[PDB]
Amino acid sequence: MRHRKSGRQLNRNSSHRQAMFRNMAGSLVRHEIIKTTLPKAKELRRVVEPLITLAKTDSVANRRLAFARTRDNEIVAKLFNELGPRFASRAGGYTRILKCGFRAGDNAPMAYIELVDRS
Amino acid sequence: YRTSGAGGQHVNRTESAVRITHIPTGIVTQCQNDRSQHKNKDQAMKQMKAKLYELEMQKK
Amino acid sequence: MIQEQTMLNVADNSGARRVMCIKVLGGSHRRYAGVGDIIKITIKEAIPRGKVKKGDVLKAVVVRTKKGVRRPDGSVIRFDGNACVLLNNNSEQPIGTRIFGPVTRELRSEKFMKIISLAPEVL
Amino acid sequence: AVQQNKPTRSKRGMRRSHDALTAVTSLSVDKTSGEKHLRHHITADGYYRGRKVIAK
RNA sequence: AGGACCGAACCGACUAAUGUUGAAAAAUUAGCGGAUGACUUGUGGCUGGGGGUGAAAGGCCAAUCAAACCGGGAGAUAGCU
RNA sequence: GCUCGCCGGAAGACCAAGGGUUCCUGUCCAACGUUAAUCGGGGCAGGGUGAGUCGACCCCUAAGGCGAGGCCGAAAGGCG
RNA sequence: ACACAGGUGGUCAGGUAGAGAAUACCAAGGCGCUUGAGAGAACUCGGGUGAAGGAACUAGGCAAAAUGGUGCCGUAACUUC
RNA sequence: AAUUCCUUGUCGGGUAAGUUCCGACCUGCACGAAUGGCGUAAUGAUGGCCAGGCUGUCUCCACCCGAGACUCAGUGAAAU
RNA sequence: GCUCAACGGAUAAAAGGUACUCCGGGGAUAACAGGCUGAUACCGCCCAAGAGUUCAUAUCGACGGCGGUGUUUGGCACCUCGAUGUCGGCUCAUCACAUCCUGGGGCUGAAGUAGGUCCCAAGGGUAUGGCUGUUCGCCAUUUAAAGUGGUACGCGAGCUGGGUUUAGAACGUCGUGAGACAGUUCGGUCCCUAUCUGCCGUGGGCGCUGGAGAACUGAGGGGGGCUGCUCCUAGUACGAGAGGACCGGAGUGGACGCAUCACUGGUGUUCGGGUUGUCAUGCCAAUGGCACUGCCCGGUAGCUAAAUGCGGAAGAGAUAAGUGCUGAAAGCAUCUAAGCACGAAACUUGCCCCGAGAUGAGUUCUCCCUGACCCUUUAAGGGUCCUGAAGGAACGUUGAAGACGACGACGUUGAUAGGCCGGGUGUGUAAGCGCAGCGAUGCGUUGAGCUAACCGGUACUAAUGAACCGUGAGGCUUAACCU
Ligand SMILES: [Mg+2]
Numbered sequence A: 001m002r003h004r005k006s007g008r009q010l011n012r013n014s015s016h017r018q019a020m021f022r023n024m025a026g027s028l029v030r031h032e033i034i035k036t037t038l039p040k041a042k043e044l045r046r047v048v049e050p051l052i053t054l055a056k057t058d059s060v061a062n063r064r065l066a067f068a069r070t071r072d073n074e075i076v077a078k079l080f081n082e083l084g085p086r087f088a089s090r091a092g093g094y095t096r097i098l099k100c101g102f103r104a105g106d107n108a109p110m111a112y113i114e115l116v117d118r119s
Numbered sequence B: 001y002r003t004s005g006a007g008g009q010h011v012n013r014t015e016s017a018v019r020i021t022h023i024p025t026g027i028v029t030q031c032q033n034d035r036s037q038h039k040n041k042d043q044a045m046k047q048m049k050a051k052l053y054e055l056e057m058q059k060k
Numbered sequence C: 001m002i003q004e005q006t007m008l009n010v011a012d013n014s015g016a017r018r019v020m021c022i023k024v025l026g027g028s029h030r031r032y033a034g035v036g037d038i039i040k041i042t043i044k045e046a047i048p049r050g051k052v053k054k055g056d057v058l059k060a061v062v063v064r065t066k067k068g069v070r071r072p073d074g075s076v077i078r079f080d081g082n083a084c085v086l087l088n089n090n091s092e093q094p095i096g097t098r099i100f101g102p103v104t105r106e107l108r109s110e111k112f113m114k115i116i117s118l119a120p121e122v123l
Numbered sequence D: 001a002v003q004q005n006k007p008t009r010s011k012r013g014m015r016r017s018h019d020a021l022t023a024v025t026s027l028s029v030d031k032t033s034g035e036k037h038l039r040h041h042i043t044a045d046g047y048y049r050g051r052k053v054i055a056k
Numbered sequence E: 001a002g003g004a005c006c007g008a009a010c011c012g013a014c015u016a017a018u019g020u021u022g023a024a025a026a027a028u029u030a031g032c033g034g035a036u037g038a039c040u041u042g043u044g045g046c047u048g049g050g051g052g053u054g055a056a057a058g059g060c061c062a063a064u065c066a067a068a069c070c071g072g073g074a075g076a077u078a079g080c081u
Numbered sequence F: 001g002c003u004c005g006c007c008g009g010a011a012g013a014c015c016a017a018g019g020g021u022u023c024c025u026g027u028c029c030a031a032c033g034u035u036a037a038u039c040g041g042g043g044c045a046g047g048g049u050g051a052g053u054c055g056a057c058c059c060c061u062a063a064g065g066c067g068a069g070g071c072c073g074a075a076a077g078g079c080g
Numbered sequence G: 001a002c003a004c005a006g007g008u009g010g011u012c013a014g015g016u017a018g019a020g021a022a023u024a025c026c027a028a029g030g031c032g033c034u035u036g037a038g039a040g041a042a043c044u045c046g047g048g049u050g051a052a053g054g055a056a057c058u059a060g061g062c063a064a065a066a067u068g069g070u071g072c073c074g075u076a077a078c079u080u081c
Numbered sequence H: 001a002a003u004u005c006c007u008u009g010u011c012g013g014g015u016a017a018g019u020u021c022c023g024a025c026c027u028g029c030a031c032g033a034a035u036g037g038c039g040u041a042a043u044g045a046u047g048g049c050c051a052g053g054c055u056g057u058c059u060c061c062a063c064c065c066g067a068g069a070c071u072c073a074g075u076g077a078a079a080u
Numbered sequence I: 001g002c003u004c005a006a007c008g009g010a011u012a013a014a015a016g017g018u019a020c021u022c023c024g025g026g027g028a029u030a031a032c033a034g035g036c037u038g039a040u041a042c043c044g045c046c047c048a049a050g051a052g053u054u055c056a057u058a059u060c061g062a063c064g065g066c067g068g069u070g071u072u073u074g075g076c077a078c079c080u081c082g083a084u085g086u087c088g089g090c091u092c093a094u095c096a097c098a099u100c101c102u103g104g105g106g107c108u109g110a111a112g113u114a115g116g117u118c119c120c121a122a123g124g125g126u127a128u129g130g131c132u133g134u135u136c137g138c139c140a141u142u143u144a145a146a147g148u149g150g151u152a153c154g155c156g157a158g159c160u161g162g163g164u165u166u167a168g169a170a171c172g173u174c175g176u177g178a179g180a181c182a183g184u185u186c187g188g189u190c191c192c193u194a195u196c197u198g199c200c201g202u203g204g205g206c207g208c209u210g211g212a213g214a215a216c217u218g219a220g221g222g223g224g225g226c227u228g229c230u231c232c233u234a235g236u237a238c239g240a241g242a243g244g245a246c247c248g249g250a251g252u253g254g255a256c257g258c259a260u261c262a263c264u265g266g267u268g269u270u271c272g273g274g275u276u277g278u279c280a281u282g283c284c285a286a287u288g289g290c291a292c293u294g295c296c297c298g299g300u301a302g303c304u305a306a307a308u309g310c311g312g313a314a315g316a317g318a319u320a321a322g323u324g325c326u327g328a329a330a331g332c333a334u335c336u337a338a339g340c341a342c343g344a345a346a347c348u349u350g351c352c353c354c355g356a357g358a359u360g361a362g363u364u365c366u367c368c369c370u371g372a373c374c375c376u377u378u379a380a381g382g383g384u385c386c387u388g389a390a391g392g393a394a395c396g397u398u399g400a401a402g403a404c405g406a407c408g409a410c411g412u413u414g415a416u417a418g419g420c421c422g423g424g425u426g427u428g429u430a431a432g433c434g435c436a437g438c439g440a441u442g443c444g445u446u447g448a449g450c451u452a453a454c455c456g457g458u459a460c461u462a463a464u465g466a467a468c469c470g471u472g473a474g475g476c477u478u479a480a481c482c483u
């Protein structure tokens, strides 16, 4: 049982759940919209919808969790320089989910995740 | 009770082992000589009887 | 909560140092007992000349538990030593005289008004 | 572990009784591209709730 | 100096869980012993079945050994199913 | 292409042994591949291995193998 | 008998830590092992932690737990010294 | 006694309690001197017994981490 | 001319071992288990020699006699040998009553306390260790008691493999020997993915005669039932004292079961800190990856017990054994025969849970539907054009609900999640900046910084217009009313 809990194992250990959302959030900020599976969007609603909580407000010391589980600093230079001032008044809900048919080779239910203000 | 001789289902699945004790004194007497229990019980009757004659004797 | 095979220390000047519980008394199938309780114990270690001997089988009352006893406020009283006070088998009264270390308020009774009067510290 | 008789093919119909599929009830029609798609899903063209939610 | 010492490779296979239509017609995982010698391993060479070989257990001799395999006597023989 | 993960006295490089086109391109997806496959050690069709000095051959010889004659043995043969 | 968790000889020996060809993390270099994607019940397979107790368990402290390096001090019986 | 039936022989030790073990006892059912006898340091993945340490062995099990099981796609056996 | 004597005579002439083993066959034939049998066994009964001072019959019972049980050992060789896995343990059991504790009695060689034996009673309860393959037993210490048996002497397609029961090896012993020992000692592979039946859960279908939404009733079924101890009564009754009650009452335990996370804890690999070696981020400073989560230190929610609340009843009926009351048969007597009372954890209830597929499909309560025509084998008829209600499912967000299904909440009116703000929470005073110190490091900002599941808010995102499904007043028969 998982009463009142929160978190999908995703048939992976926690060190790979760590390292996968590194690149998945690491590329959504780049292209503003990507194709992923729907449980890697719906558990990612516990992840990427908090990984935009990562994108709130610039200090000097706030350049750092976006280094930490990202291993990247270029995308850091995109978030608080461009996207922080972009989503400057939205109090949550910075994304949108588009269930977009099923994956070919395994019938996996895919979806599109994206930003709210993509244009 | 059963003996623990070799043979198994001829030994351990039968009550070939006897033990006869005394009520007012408490003197046991076992026997596991032959396969039959009445070659043992009746033998342990004799051995308790052999103890019994000594009970007056060893005392006196 | 003391089961069998449990080494306990000694809380009086009886003469023993290491005892071991061999039976929890006082109840049918009574698996455990805390403070204010009676257990049959043996003696595993005693002084070279005392009131006791290595291997005496006798009763004792449990006075300090590492496990804990609760109070109606919710406060639970634990210790860091598991010691006990040796009793007679028949009169079932303490044999030693000089009580070592503090004890608790659950110990007091008509049966055990004697020990708390000799205790150095009662919480 | 394993059967002791041959199973009847009539039982094989009864085991496969609940094993049937189920098709879709009704397809959500788009209101701008005017085409059927899956309910709560986008169209094939890239429309959802009327608007063009994705340039393909 | 050592049929010395701890311990890699190497060599062995003692315990335990696995696995038992297996990953595998004997293996893995954890440990274990030996690990300068009565060591280990290449390339060859030799010994042939009532024979071989054997720090010996009836062991081993092409996944088979109290008498190897293949062919033949031979449609052995069967008071038995 | 971008990160990420693993190996690294190897899960890297290199040969013998052994394999005997698997190698390189083009093409194809029926079968083959424990799924798809647009891919492939798959099919099909083309290519591709250059030596006085490297290896073999070759000159030696060991364990050994054979053996003129020779010896022995019904015969076959045994030993040399 | 498989694109088989096996077996197969020789040559090659980068950095840091390290006695080390141990181990760790790595370089060069090479791969992510031919079904996936979900769900997060029992249940086994592996794992980690555990109050108080500490062998009572059990055929049996089996396995687990624990011990573990380098210096230095110190070290019994007995000895075939 | 790796040998003793009786036999859990008896006594001592050890344990709260010991059909085990360690000392004796000799009544050796049926030891015994190169199919050697007795003893023996060192040795042993050798047999038994006892202690300390140690701990989910256990009391008395709880909780997480993964690999399957279960759901959906693709494929798809088996003994009987 | 033959103890050819195994004497209708296999040859003039012939012993063993095989656990290294093998073939052919057999339930024609052994070992376990079933079967019949009940000798033996066990358990009762009859007689009463006697013991018990006297007193057979409180307690016992010689000599004998009669049964019951299938339960000991056996007998038999009917099932099974083209396989029916056995000792003990472990895990789970369930049944009997010939009752171990508790309950109810009778008698006593029963003052009480304590027993004795007998009867009723199977609801519930009914130890841990040491020894040993164990069983059994002994012992230690418990307990209210440590019941006895049936169950393939229950249970290996559940586990264990110590014992027995392979091959290795040895002693004692026997045999010249190969070898063997109901003689020991060391070592020695426990397979099976569940078709059915059965069981535990959980669905689908159709039915219950218009449809839908609900509430129930409760046929029936299940669960549950144990007990100590202290105190009062009371040192009272009793007894010479010692000793020490009935009944009734109170309190606290044990064991068990249910519920639970407020507490007390564990766990908490997604919260946080410390720290080792290395690698990378140009480089410092910072971080991060990997090293069992690298090694620790802690901790939220959740889940949890060792954490804390309940639970066993009281009561009613009918009784068992037993005690009676009136009372004839039987001028008395007499619990019975007519009548009649009392009487136990058994019974039925009372307690909880399940429950109308209770086909005997029940009940009450609420909502929905008042369109047109053809056909002929003219009717519970078929078909066609309008109509699509109540509601339902589907879909999405979801859950302290869950294998899946099902269940529950919610779908813009909207707080269903996620995000966001607030809050708490927990690691434990961040980073950068200063400052001191040769430096490591310390101090200033500083419960700062961070913060998983949580508490309060927020539509910020994602929960779509539709469509689908289900329709259009509901058979016959009498009956009763109303007209
Ligand atoms: Mg089927």
Ligand SMILES: [Mg+2]
Residues within 6 Å of the ligand: I044, I045
């Ligand atoms: Mg009777």
